[PDB]
């Protein structure tokens, strides 16, 4: 039984980074080396494990997190990084054991007028814990005055849209991201490569 990574990687539409999806991988197998040596991805960095050793190892569970960010923000998808995406949208732990995969998505997530449907969190009262999702849309209270749902002075909508246009540069272009995380607990190993 082959693990359904095609559902994650080749999904037609991707989630906003603030509402990043997470798919569970329960019991199946897959050849990570084929994914590693694939030219489709511009970034494929692993942490806590060797990308080539993944075929011989087995874990209790694997998670596939998918979202869309800008090019120059892919570096924030790493352990111990800071910035709008790392602090307010998607945060990786310091002991991350997984791989960060990303590719340029300009042909899809860019419209002639400008795709404004992908967003990120700009304001937040505190930083996210690792693997935390916040999809709230409360008006951010910058001062001591309650906003009561009204935007204005010291009262800002917490989300901001990416200006994804075809005329943008590589940094200001959309990049689809898939983050695999491998966990092993007291439960039996479950998701595997072909070697084991």
């Amino acid at each position, epitope marked *: 039984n082959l693990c359904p990574f095609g559902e994650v990687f080749n999904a037609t539409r991707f989630a906003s980074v603030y509402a990043w999806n997470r798919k569970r991988i329960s019991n199946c197998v897959a050849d990570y080396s084929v994914l590693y040596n694939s030219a489709s991805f511009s970034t494929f960095k692993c942490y806590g494990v060797s990308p080539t050793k993944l075929n011989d190892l087995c874990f209790t569970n694997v998670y596939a997190d998918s979202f869309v960010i800008r090019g120059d923000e892919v570096r924030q998808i790493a352990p111990g990084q800071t910035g709008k995406i790392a602090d307010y949208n998607y945060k990786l732990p310091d002991d991350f054991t997984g791989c960060v995969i990303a590719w340029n998505s300009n042909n899809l997530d860019s419209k002639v007028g400008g795709n404004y449907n992908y967003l990120y969190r700009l304001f937040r009262k505190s930083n996210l814990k690792p693997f935390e999702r916040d999809i709230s849309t409360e008006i951010y209270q*910058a*001062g*001591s005055t309650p906003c009561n749902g*009204v935007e*204005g002075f010291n009262c*800002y909508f917490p989300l901001q849209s990416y200006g994804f246009q075809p005329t943008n540069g590589v940094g200001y272009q959309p990049y689809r991201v898939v983050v695999l995380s491998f966990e092993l607990l007291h439960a039996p190993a479950t998701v595997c490569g072909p070697k084991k």
Partner: antibody
Amino acid sequence: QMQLVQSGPEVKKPGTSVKVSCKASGFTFMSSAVQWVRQARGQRLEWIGWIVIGSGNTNYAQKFQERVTITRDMSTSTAYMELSSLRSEDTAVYYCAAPYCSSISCNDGFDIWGQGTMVTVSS
Amino acid sequence: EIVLTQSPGTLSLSPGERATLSCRASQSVSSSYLAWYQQKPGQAPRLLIYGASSRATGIPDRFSGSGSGTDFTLTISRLEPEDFAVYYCQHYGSSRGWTFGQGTKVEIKR
């Protein structure tokens, strides 16, 4: 500490543009917002527009929507106001203003004011 | 389009007297976004009151803000020589259309 310092005076000829700077220090500029106001000599205060430092989102008085731009530079903690197609009626002192902010909270009014920038439009 | 009308245009009083300045709005506005400013002839505006009734840091106790809805008041309980200046109210509610009043001059009666 705690100040907005504006650029020096300007003498501009009609039809040209002017860009006034407003550099912040002594407070958490990233959390704040900057409004721009002008005043002809012996006249009232006239609201131009404002910008949210964190987002860069701007809102202008419709009187200036056609020829004003308010921006900000995070790296230098500086806010800018650029007025184009300058007319004689644009001769005034231009002020920026912002609430003091800390790491936790912003003040609930515009309590930090720049020293003002004189802009003279004339041939 | 919210308009702020200040009255009187000029206030002619003596040091030690009570000053009562008025700011009327064409619609009801939130008290949380009405402010009072002082401006001496050569200097920049200076925030006195925010949120209709809150004194800014360092403003003397004799300055007081009150009102709600459309009628807002700045009171100076007993005028000091430095208090004789021009006062503006400002509405900064919502994200657009902020306006000032035309200003009230507080001059020395003679």
